[PDB]
RNA sequence: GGCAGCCAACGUGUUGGCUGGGUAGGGGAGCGUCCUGCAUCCGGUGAAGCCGCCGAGUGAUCGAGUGGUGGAGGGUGUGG
RNA sequence: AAGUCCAAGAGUGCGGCAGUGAGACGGCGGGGGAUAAGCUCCGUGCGUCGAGAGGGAAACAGCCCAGAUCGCCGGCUAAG
RNA sequence: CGUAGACGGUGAGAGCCCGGUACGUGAAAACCCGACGUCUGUCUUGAUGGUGUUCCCGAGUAGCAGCGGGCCCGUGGAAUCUGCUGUGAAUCUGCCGGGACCACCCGGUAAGCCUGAAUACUUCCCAGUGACCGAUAGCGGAUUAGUACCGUGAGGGAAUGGUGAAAAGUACCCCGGGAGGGGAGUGAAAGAGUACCUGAAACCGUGCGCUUACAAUCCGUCAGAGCCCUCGACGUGUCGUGGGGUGAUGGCGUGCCUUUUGAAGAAUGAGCCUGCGAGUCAGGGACAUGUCGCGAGGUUAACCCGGGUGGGGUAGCCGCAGCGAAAGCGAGUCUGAAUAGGGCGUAUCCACACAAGAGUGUGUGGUGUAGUGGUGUGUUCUGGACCCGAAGCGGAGUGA
C-alpha cells in the first residue's frame, strides 16, 4: 500500500503561501522562505498584541498631559486629584474628553484641583 | 441481529502505535535517542559494563554439580486427597492423574501436608513418613509400586 | 530465532522458591591464610543480588 | 430452546427441530467474535507484496566516484535509498498473516453468532432447496423468497447434496457453505441462515457429545 | 470574558478551588494521506485533481457551502 | 508542637521507558597562579542561563525586577 | 434467463450486444498411461523336521601407535567416526559396541554390493490469484534494453507511456521563402491539432489598480493618513457592528537548521520548485503492561481431513513444593555434635491462646492460594535492523 504524499503535502503549503501575500521579495513566492517569515510574523503579532495596550496608554497619557497643561495643571497632579475626588474615569475616555469636548475636561480639571491638598509638598 | 460492521474491539484493547521521527510535535529529529554517542546509532550489549570486570565474571561460579541421574518425583500432598475423593476408596497413580493432581507420565511421591480424613487406599511410587502415618492413621493403607 | 541464555551468568546466579536471585560472595577462592575466619564465614553461603544489578542479571538469565 | 419448523418446497411443513440452548441460546460476545473474524480475514490475506532492498536491486557494486576532493556528497553506491532507482528501506516483504486463536474461542464465536440469529428468528430448516434430479435457480429462488425477504442468506447444506447447491449458487446474495465448515464470518454476513434438516442435524450432532 | 489539567461538593453535569514557560525526555488524546471487510450515500443533470470566493475549528486542518476549469469515479460511518 | 493540606502536585518501596555523565557566569568560603586572567580546580536546600519569554542596564545568555493559558483601544505596581 | 449475476470488451456502471462463463461435447497423428496376450525367466531326478564332529562365515582388514579431521565435546580422563604413516590377528569357549580402562552381562555380526516411498528445487510450458506496484514506482528494461552510450578489457549501463468514441488528423482561402498562424470546416469538445487526457509549482511576460527618485529597510508586525474597489442604509454624498487592495508615516524588531557554556552570527548545511529519501519485519524468542477466552488448569507442534478462514491431532510446554553440591529428605530442608542459632521455603490476611517486650515468636483453628493461550503497545535478542558515509581486507578474474 504505497501512498503518494502529494495530496497531504500541498495543504500546508497553500495555507502558508496564502498567508504570505504582500510579502516583498521571495518571502511571498517560496513555501520555505514564506514559512520562515510566518514564524517571525506570528511571534511579532503576539508581541505587538501584548504591547498595543501599552502604546495606546502612552498615547492617551500624552494627550491628557498636553490638555492638562493647557488648563494649567500637571498630568500627575491632575490624576492624583481625580483619584482623591473619587471620579474614576480611565485614561482612554479621559483622552476622548481632552480631544472632543474641552469644556468637560476643563470642568474635570476644576474638580481635580478642588479635591487636592492645600500643600502637595506637605509631610503628610 | 449483529452484522459484520457491528463488531468492535473491547475498550482498551487496541493502542495506537508510536510512529517516531515524524515531526517535532511528538518525537522528532532524534526519535527519543537524544544526542550522539554509542547509543545514538546502535545499542549496548547487556553483558557490557564499560570494560570493568562484569557482574557475570567477577563472581564465583556456583558450587556443585548436576547429577544427570537425578530421580525427580511429582508430588501430591495428602490434603488434596480429601478434596479429590469425597469418600476415599482406591486411589492409584492413574486415577489420581485424572483429577489433575500430577502430570500424566511421571514418578509420583505422596507428601503429608494437609489433613486427611477419609478411608483411602493409596498406591504411588513413593511416600513420605508423615504421609504414610496420615494414610494409615485415617484408616487406609498405602503400598509402593 | 529463540533467545539464548547467557551461559556465564547461569552458572553464577540462581533463583529461590519465591523468585529472588541469589549469588555467591567473592574473595574466598585462595589467599585464605591471612583472612580471619570471621571474614571467611561472612563471605560464604548465598546472598540476594542487589536491586541495582537485578535488572541486568534478569536479562542475562532469561536471555 | 427454539423449535424451528421444517418447511418443504411444496409450501408445507414436515416437523420441527429442537435447538439446544447450550448451542443456540448463548449470550453474544462482541469483542470475542470481533477477534475471531479479524483473525479469519487475516488468514485470508494473501500477503504477496514485495520490494527490493538496497542489495537486491541491479548494479550498485561500484562506489560511484572518489570519496574526497570532488565537492559532492559522499555516496557509496547508486542503489542507495536516496537515489532514484535505489533500494527501498523498510518496504514490504511477503508475510503470513494468519494468527492461531484458541479452539474454544472460535467455537464460542460460532455459537454466539448462531444464537444471535436464533434469538431473532433468522434460522430456518427445510427438507431441501429444490425437488431433485435437476438444478433450477428459478424455483429455488421462489422458495427462498417465500422463506425470507432479506438480501443475504447462508444456505448450509450437506456436501453430497449437489442438486440443491447448484440451484441456489447463482443468486446474487446467497452464500453456500457446508455444516462442518461453519464459521462466524459467514453467519454474521447473512441476515438469515437457512439450514437443511440433514445439515442442522449434522451440526447439532457434531456438538452433542 | 474564553479554554484546559488536577481535585472536591452536591450529585451524575454542573459548580467551585488550585494550577497550565519550557530543551533532552516520559505519558495522553488527535489531524491529514492511501489500501481494504461490512453498511449506507453521491456522480456525464458532471467524480477526482487543480484554481478561486465566502466562511469555520483550540491545533494539525475543514468546508455533502459555493463558482471556474475538468471528464469517471468518489463521500461518510464502524472495524482492519 | 504546629503550619501548609479541594496542595507541596511533597516523601518512601516495586516496576516499564528514559535522557544525562563537554556546563557557564554572578554572590559567599578556599587551593593553583603574581593572593593576574572573560584562567583553572573544589564547597554552598546559593542564584540566574542552559531549558526563560516580558521590563531595566544605550546595545549586551549568566546582573536587577518578574516566571508568558488566550483575548481586551481598563486599573495598580516592581527594578529603573 | 440462471447448473451461466467469473471476467473482459462495446461511444459512460451491461446476467439478457460481443468474446465468453455454468455445463457439456471432440482427435487423424504423435506422445505419456494403464490392461490383456505373444515373449522372458525361474521352481518342481524330488520334500520335511531330527541325531553326533571337522571345515567355513569378506586380510595388508580389525586392532595398536604417531600426527591430524570431525563429533555438544577447543586434547581433555576422551570413548564412537575418520585421513596419512608405521606395525599388524583370529573364524564363533571368535570379533565389535555399550564415553578412559578391567570383569561380568546385554546388543550385534565389520572389513561385498543393489534398493521405491515419504524430502529439495524451477531454466521452460499451462492455468490462475493478490487489504502487490502503476511510469522518478514495478524488473536494469511498459518505448530501439542489456539497447544507445562509457571502457583496451573484465565490465558498467541509461532516458523515452496517455489526441479522440471514431482520423472524422483541419479541403479551400489569406499573411509568410518556409516555420508559424488567421478565417473556413471536423468533432460533444480543437480551454482535445498527431509540440496532442488533467495541466500544479518554480521560472517568464503583458494589461490595470495603489505606491515609490533627502533616503540607511532580517524586509515583518502593531498603529496609521491618502487613494481605489465592493456590500448595506438613508438618500442623491455621508455613515456603518462593514469587507477587500495599496500603503506616506510612527513604535518594536539580530533568518532557519544543526551543534554548542554560549551563534543574527564572520561555525555547519541549504540557488529555487515539483516528485522521491530514514525505528520496519520474522520468531509458540525475553520482560512489562492493556484486552479477551477458559480456569487448578491452560494450550496444542509437526501432522491428517476441509477449493476457505473450519475440524481433528496429548507429543510436548507452562502452572501445580521446596531445601540441598549431591545421595537424599519433603512443609520442610541445608549446615551442625546440637529440640542451637541462621539460610531458603512453607500465597495472604483474621482470631484465640501459650512465651518474651531483643525488634515479636510459636501453635491451634479459620480464609483459602492463579495460571495459561490468543492478541494490541513499549523495550529488548538474532538478523544489513532508523537512514547515509571511509581509508582499506579477502576470493576469482581483466589488463604491457
Ligand atoms: Mg503589502
Ligand atoms: Mg504490528
Ligand atoms: Mg525536538
Ligand atoms: Mg528538525
Ligand atoms: Mg527513549
Ligand atoms: Mg545529530
Ligand atoms: Mg556530547
Ligand atoms: Mg546517549
Ligand atoms: Mg550478543
Ligand atoms: Mg583494564
Ligand atoms: Mg548451559
Ligand atoms: Mg577452594
Ligand atoms: Mg581460615
Ligand atoms: Mg551489490
Ligand atoms: Mg560547492
Ligand atoms: Mg563500501
Ligand atoms: Mg526500482
Ligand atoms: Mg485448528
Ligand atoms: Mg475548572
Ligand atoms: Mg506547559
Ligand atoms: Mg504560569
Ligand atoms: Mg520533547
Ligand atoms: Mg479526503
Ligand atoms: Mg471503510
Ligand atoms: Mg449510483
Ligand atoms: Mg455530455
Ligand atoms: Mg482514489
Ligand atoms: Mg462546469
Ligand atoms: Mg470541481
Ligand atoms: Mg485505522
Ligand atoms: Mg505546610
Ligand atoms: Mg502545584
Ligand atoms: Mg514531583
Ligand atoms: Mg565521560
Ligand atoms: Mg565531565
Ligand atoms: Mg561545573
Ligand atoms: Mg571558564
Ligand atoms: Mg572566588
Ligand atoms: Mg588554584
Ligand atoms: Mg573562569
Ligand atoms: Mg560557584
Ligand atoms: Mg546543551
Ligand atoms: Mg530574559
Ligand atoms: Mg531557570
Ligand atoms: Mg537581590
Ligand atoms: Mg500609577
Ligand atoms: Mg521605586
Ligand atoms: Mg462485468
Ligand atoms: Mg562378516
Ligand atoms: Mg578434534
Ligand atoms: Mg576426542
Ligand atoms: Mg547406494
Ligand atoms: Mg523504470
Ligand atoms: Mg503521471
Ligand atoms: Mg532504471
Ligand atoms: Mg567500445
Ligand atoms: Mg462544429
Ligand atoms: Mg473538455
Ligand atoms: Mg507540452
Ligand atoms: Mg494538454
Ligand atoms: Mg520623497
Ligand atoms: Mg540609525
Ligand atoms: Mg514599519
Ligand atoms: Mg528597528
Ligand atoms: Mg563541530
Ligand atoms: Mg556549535
Ligand atoms: Mg567553543
Ligand atoms: Mg551562516
Ligand atoms: Mg554574514
Ligand atoms: Mg564543525
Ligand atoms: Mg553553502
Ligand atoms: Mg530520490
Ligand atoms: Mg515480533
Ligand atoms: Mg535444586
Ligand atoms: Mg561449613
Ligand atoms: Mg530453620
Ligand atoms: Mg487472563
Ligand atoms: Mg501481551
Ligand atoms: Mg581488492
Ligand atoms: Mg594479460
**Residue C51 to residue B59: CA distance in whole angstroms:** 16
- CA dihedral sign of residues C47, C52, C54, C60: negative
The residue to which cell 498406591 is assigned: B123
Q: How many angstroms away from the CA of B3 is the closest CA of chain D?
A: 5
Q: Beta partners for D13?
A: D7
Asked if residue D13 lies in contact with residue D7, where contact means CB atoms within 8 angstroms, the answer is yes
**Residue D114 to residue D186: CA distance in whole angstroms:** 10
Pairing of strands B141-144, B119-124: parallel
Q: Beta partners for A76?
A: none
Chain E positions within 7 A of any protein Cβ atom are 24-30, 32-35, 37-39, 49-52, 60-62, 77-80
Nucleotide nearest to B5 (CA to C1'): E38
- CA dihedral sign of residues D115, D118, D124, D127: positive
Resolution in A: 3.0
Print the SS3 string covering chain D: CCEEEEECCCCCEEEEEECCHHHHCCCCCHHHHHHHHHHHHHHHCCCCCCCCCCCCCCCCCCCCCCCCCCCCCCCCCCCCCCCCCCCCCCCCCCCCCCCCCCHHHHHHHHHHHHHHHHHCCCEEEECCCCCCCCCCHHHHHHHHHHHCCCCCEEEECCCCCHHHHHCCCCCCCEEEECHHHCCHHHHHHCCEEEEEHHHHHHHHHHCCC
As given in the structure block, the three cell numbers for residue B58 are: 567477577
Q: How many CB atoms lie within 10 A of CB C36?
A: 8
Distance D68 CA to ligand 7 centre (A): 27
Q: How many angstroms away from the CA of B34 is the closest CA of chain C?
A: 22
Tell me how the structure was determined: cryo-EM
Alpha-helix residue ranges (DSSP H) falling in B8-138: 78-84, 94-97, 129-137
Q: Nearest-5° angle of CA D133, CA D137, CA D143?
A: 95
Burial bucket for residue A113 (CB in 10 Å: 0-12, 13-18, 19+): middle
**Residue A50 to residue A59: CA distance in whole angstroms:** 16
**Residue D158 to residue D176: CA distance in whole angstroms:** 10
As given in the structure block, the three cell numbers for residue B35 are: 544526542
**Residue A64 to residue D62: CA distance in whole angstroms:** 81
Q: Beta partners for D176?
A: D155
Helix axes D103-119, D30-44, angle to 10 degrees: 120
**Residue D204 to residue D179: CA distance in whole angstroms:** 10
Asked if residue B101 lies in contact with residue B89, where contact means CB atoms within 8 angstroms, the answer is no
- Which of A52, A50, A58, A51 lies closest to A91 in space, CA to CA? A58
Q: How many angstroms away from the CA of D190 is the closest CA of chain B?
A: 8
**Residue D52 to residue D81: CA distance in whole angstroms:** 11
- Which of D172, D170, D174 lies closest to D147 in space, CA to CA? D174
Backbone angles phi, psi at A46, to 5 degrees: -60, -50
**Residue D110 to residue D116: CA distance in whole angstroms:** 10
Asked if residue D42 lies in contact with residue D97, where contact means CB atoms within 8 angstroms, the answer is yes
- Which of D199, D185, D108 lies closest to B5 in space, CA to CA? D185
Starting at the edge strand found earlier in the chain, the sheet holding D3-7 runs D13-18, D3-7, D123-126, D192-196, D153-156, D174-177
Is the distance between the Cβ of D69 and the closest atom of strand G smaller than 7 Å?
no
Asked if residue C10 lies in contact with residue C34, where contact means CB atoms within 8 angstroms, the answer is no
Asked if residue B125 lies in contact with residue B108, where contact means CB atoms within 8 angstroms, the answer is yes
Pairing of strands B141-144, C21-24: unpaired
- Which of B141, B66, B69, B71 lies closest to B106 in space, CA to CA? B71
Those chains having 3 or more beta-carbon pairs within 8 angstroms of chain D are B
Q: Beta partners for D124?
A: D194
Interface of D with B (CB under 8 A): 28, 30-31, 33-35, 37, 113, 116-117, 120, 122, 185, 188-189, 191
**Residue D36 to residue B131: CA distance in whole angstroms:** 48
Interchain contact, D113 vs B2, CB within 8 Å: yes
Amino acid at each position: 500500500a504505497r501512498v503518494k504524499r502529494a495530496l497531504n503535502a500541498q495543504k500546508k503549503r497553500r495555507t502558508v503561501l496564502k498567508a504570505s501575500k504582500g510579502y516583498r521579495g521571495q518571502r511571498s513566492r517560496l513555501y520555505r522562505k514564506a514559512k520562515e517569515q510566518q514564524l517571525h510574523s506570528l511571534t511579532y503579532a503576539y508581541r505587538d498584541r501584548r504591547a498595543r495596550k501599552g502604546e495606546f496608554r502612552k498615547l492617551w497619557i500624552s494627550r491628557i498631559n498636553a490638555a492638562a497643561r493647557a488648563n494649567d495643571i500637571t498630568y500627575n497632579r491632575l490624576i492624583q486629584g481625580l483619584k482623591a475626588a473619587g471620579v474614576e474615569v480611565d485614561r482612554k475616555n479621559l483622552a476622548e474628553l481632552a480631544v472632543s469636548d474641552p469644556a468637560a475636561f476643563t470642568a474635570l480639571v476644576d474638580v481635580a484641583r478642588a479635591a487636592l491638598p492645600e500643600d502637595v509638598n506637605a509631610p503628610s | 441481529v449483529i452484522k459484520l460492521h457491528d463488531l468492535k474491539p473491547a475498550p482498551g484493547e487496541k493502542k495506537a502505535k508510536t510512529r517516531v521521527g515524524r515531526g517535532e510535535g511528538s518525537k522528532g529529529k532524534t526519535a527519543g535517542r537524544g544526542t550522539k554517542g554509542t547509543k545514538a546509532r546502535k545499542n549496548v550489549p547487556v553483558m557490557f559494563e564499560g570494560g570493568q570486570m562484569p557482574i557475570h565474571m567477577r563472581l564465583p561460579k556456583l558450587k556443585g554439580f548436576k547429577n544427570r541421574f537425578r530421580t525427580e518425583y511429582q508430588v501430591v500432598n495428602v490434603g488434596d486427597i480429601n478434596k479429590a475423593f469425597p469418600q476415599g476408596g482406591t486411589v492409584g497413580v492413574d486415577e489420581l492423574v485424572a483429577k489433575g493432581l500430577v502430570r500424566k507420565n511421571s514418578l509420583v511421591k505422596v507428601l503429608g501436608d494437609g489433613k486427611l480424613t477419609v478411608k483411602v487406599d493409596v498406591t504411588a511410587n513413593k511416600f513420605s513418613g508423615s504421609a504414610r502415618e496420615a494414610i494409615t492413621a485415617a484408616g487406609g493403607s498405602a503400598t509402593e509400586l | 530465532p529463540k533467545a539464548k541464555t547467557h551461559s556465564g551468568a547461569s552458572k553464577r546466579f540462581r533463583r529461590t522458591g519465591t523468585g529472588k536471585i541469589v549469588r555467591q560472595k567473592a574473595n574466598r577462592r585462595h589467599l585464605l591464610e591471612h583472612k580471619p575466619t570471621k571474614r571467611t564465614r561472612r563471605l560464604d553461603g548465598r546472598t540476594t543480588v542487589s536491586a541495582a544489578d537485578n535488572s541486568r542479571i534478569n536479562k542475562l538469565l532469561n536471555g | 430452546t427454539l423449535k424451528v419448523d421444517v418447511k418443504t418446497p411444496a409450501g408445507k411443513t414436515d416437523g420441527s427441530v429442537e435447538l439446544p440452548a447450550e448451542l443456540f441460546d448463548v449470550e453474544p460476545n462482541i469483542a470475542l467474535m470481533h477477534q475471531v473474524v479479524t483473525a479469519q480475514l487475516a488468514a485470508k490475506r494473501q500477503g504477496t507484496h514485495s520490494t527490493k532492498t538496497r542489495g537486491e536491486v541491479s548494479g550498485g557494486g561500484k562506489k560511484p566516484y572518489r570519496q574526497k576532493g570532488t565537492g559532492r556528497a559522499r555516496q557509496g553506491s547508486t542503489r542507495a535509498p536516496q537515489f532514484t532507482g535505489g533500494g527501498t528501506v523498510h518496504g514490504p516483504k511477503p508475510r503470513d498473516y494468519s494468527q492461531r486463536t484458541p479452539k474454544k474461542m472460535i467455537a464460542a464465536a460460532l455459537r454466539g453468532a448462531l444464537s444471535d440469529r436464533a434469538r431473532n428468528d433468522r434460522i430456518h430448516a427445510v427438507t431441501e432447496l429444490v425437488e431433485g434430479q435437476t438444478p433450477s435457480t428459478k424455483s429455488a429462488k421462489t422458495f427462498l423468497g417465500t422463506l425470507t425477504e432479506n438480501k443475504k442468506v447462508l444456505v448450509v447444506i450437506g456436501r453430497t447434496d449437489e442438486v440443491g447447491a447448484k440451484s441456489v449458487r447463482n443468486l446474487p446474495g446467497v452464500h453456500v457453505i457446508s455444516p462442518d465448515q461453519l464459521n462466524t464470518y459467514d453467519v454474521l454476513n447473512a441476515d438469515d441462515v437457512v439450514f437443511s434438516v440433514e445439515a442442522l442435524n449434522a451440526y447439532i450432532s457434531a456438538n452433542s457429545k
